[PDB]
Design a protein around this ligand. Structure first.
Ligand SMILES: OC[C@H]1O[C@@H](O[C@H]2[C@H](O)[C@@H](O)[C@H](O)O[C@@H]2CO)[C@H](O)[C@@H](O)[C@H]1O
Length: 138
C-alpha cells in the first residue's frame, strides 16, 4: 500500500494520450476522496467524491487559480461505495480530462488550465487505502 496523502510526480506535466490509473479501496464510512492535478500551487483539475453532502453523494470537480476556486461542476452519478475496491482512470484528451471508474465512463472536465505540460503533480487524498498510482502513454 501507499501512504495517503500521496504525491505522484507527472514528469513534464500531462499531455493528450496520457492515462493515469489509481487503484484503491474506500474506507468504511468514508466522507471524501480527492484527486488534485496541480500546476504549481494551482489545481488544474480537482475531482472530489463527497459521501455525505446534505445526505447526498456527489462528485465535485473544479479548478483553483491563485488560491481561488472557480465554478463547480457536479456529478450525481456516484460509483464509489464505502468498503469497496475501485479503479479511477483519468485519460487526458485534447479538450478535457475523461474519467472512468471501474471501467465505466463517469465524467469529462474541460481544460481550464491550458499549460498541460506544467500540470506536474497529482495529489491523492481522502478516506481510502491506496494500492497503486501510475501512468502510461496509450
Ligand atoms: O470547489 C471545490 C472546493 O469546494 C470547497 O467547498 C465549497 C463548497 O463545495 C461550496 O458548496 C461552498 O459554497 O464553499 C466551499 C468552499 O469554497 C472545498 O472546501 C474544497 O476542498 C474543494 O472541494
Amino acid at each position: 500500500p501507499l501512504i495517503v496523502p500521496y504525491n505522484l510526480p507527472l514528469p513534464g506535466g500531462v499531455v493528450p494520450r496520457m492515462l493515469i490509473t489509481i487503484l484503491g479501496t474506500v474506507k468504511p464510512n468514508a466522507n471524501r476522496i480527492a484527486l488534485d492535478f496541480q500546476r504549481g500551487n494551482d489545481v488544474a483539475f480537482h475531482f472530489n467524491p463527497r459521501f455525505n453532502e446534505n445526505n447526498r453523494r456527489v462528485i465535485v470537480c473544479n479548478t483553483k487559480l491563485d488560491n481561488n476556486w472557480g465554478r463547480e461542476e457536479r456529478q450525481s452519478v456516484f460509483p464509489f461505495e464505502s468498503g469497496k475496491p475501485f479503479k479511477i482512470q483519468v485519460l487526458v484528451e485534447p479538450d478535457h480530462f475523461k474519467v472512468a471508474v471501474n471501467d465505466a465512463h463517469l465524467l469529462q472536465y474541460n481544460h481550464r488550465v491550458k499549460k498541460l505540460n506544467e500540470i506536474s503533480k497529482l495529489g491523492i487524498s481522502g478516506d481510502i487505502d491506496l494500492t497503486s498510482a501510475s501512468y502510461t502513454m496509450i
